Amino acid sequence: GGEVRHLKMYAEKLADGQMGYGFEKGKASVPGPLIEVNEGDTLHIEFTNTMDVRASLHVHGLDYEISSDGTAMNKSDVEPGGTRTYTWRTHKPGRRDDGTWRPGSAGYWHYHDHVVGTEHGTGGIRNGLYGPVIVRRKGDVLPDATHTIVFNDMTINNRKPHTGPDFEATVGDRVEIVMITHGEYYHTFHMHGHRWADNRTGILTGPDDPSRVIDNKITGPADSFGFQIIAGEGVGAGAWMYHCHVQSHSDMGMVGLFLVKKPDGTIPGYEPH
Template structure:
């Protein structure tokens, strides 16, 4: 076999790009990453609460091919807001529209976890010294995020402008989760008594549970439905799975209270250790995520989950994980 000069020069250029400073990273992000074009709107609910809703989400591959995944999301504003799922190596442009009845107040998105420049901080000029990084009526604002290597995890995003630029209005409902899946596509989990790397493609359902004062606010990402489906579950929901399905929980704190998330009958590994646990401390904006096998070792049933702070339990901070045959 002979190698053409053109092919040889392409190989040489590629080899050089790996050696050049920053070349490996540039090659990685050019090869692996999707560019996400996301438009969200902040709206008012009839209850007086505020909530984000999905307007559109398109994914652009490195070869220019585009995919519209807007249909995956729930329609209308929800608490929590849309769960955004991207992968390590991806970039995103997130545009926020102002759709709140009170037109006098700007609204923003401040995100955790990803890399961004100071003009994508989602705060007002009095805090960031650069600009009012918020949407006003008829004047959307665009944020640029990079899910750089090392940013995989479950992160919150929330308002940092409405009503009070020091606080924002996250406690009125303006929050949602950003899940950054690892580039490897695998997450360690305790399955059948052993710690193994679970392929995210084998996870059937993901439950996002926010612990806000004395209430859980939930959402399901269902991966059984073709193309995936986000299902709003609102407050203190029953979540469900079939026996033996691998499911992933994301538990995030919001507000002022400290919580202890507990799920009956199931265990998972404490991040960074090999220890099995069934309870985890959750403070404001702290979070955890874990994969488990529904009903493993215990069978089907209405497996209760709740905050284990007695005062919060007395206020009804609980729900069920229904495992069926």
């Protein structure tokens, strides 16, 4: 189009010492809420830091001016109790005058804090100040649901070991995953029963797309990718594990379930009593 959109966000400290972003005070989540826009759109985010330490929003991929980089160095962070408007722009792909192709902002991206604990946001990220951003290209396939999976150090979504998260679908649902990594460690994301293309959308464009089809992918801090799968396609219903495949990581609890249900709402072998 594109559209000018406006949005409020808050950073807040949670009772247990974690920190989260939210669209409303008292409704902070880890990961933070999904921001989704179309190439061309501009997003003005009125950000309020409700915490007692400085905090910021820094985003990957999108077009922001230096005044919205979220760093102390560029005076782009937010004092305790303060408010700042960050502007994220996006563009559509197209040919420059030099004849090269400007790529477009479309992709799976993310936002996170850049000043809590250290000037690279090490404490903020660790505490939960991260969330996903999706930029869609005109004509991209849209899913029934999007789930965000973040490997943050040795946790998934800052959860305790062996507590998921778990996600549920029914055979045939189009499910989108946004997969983000943060912290200190490399990981390998693996899903049982499902595969995707290692390219922008996770979907091959057709028979001439030579991208590798995979079910396992090495990631490190601040990597983001995403894909769509048809739940149970060619494989049926089941409690399908996803996990980090680094062996000590899966053993120490970086595992969850993709619960793909039959049309009767049950998972083979785990029917309700």
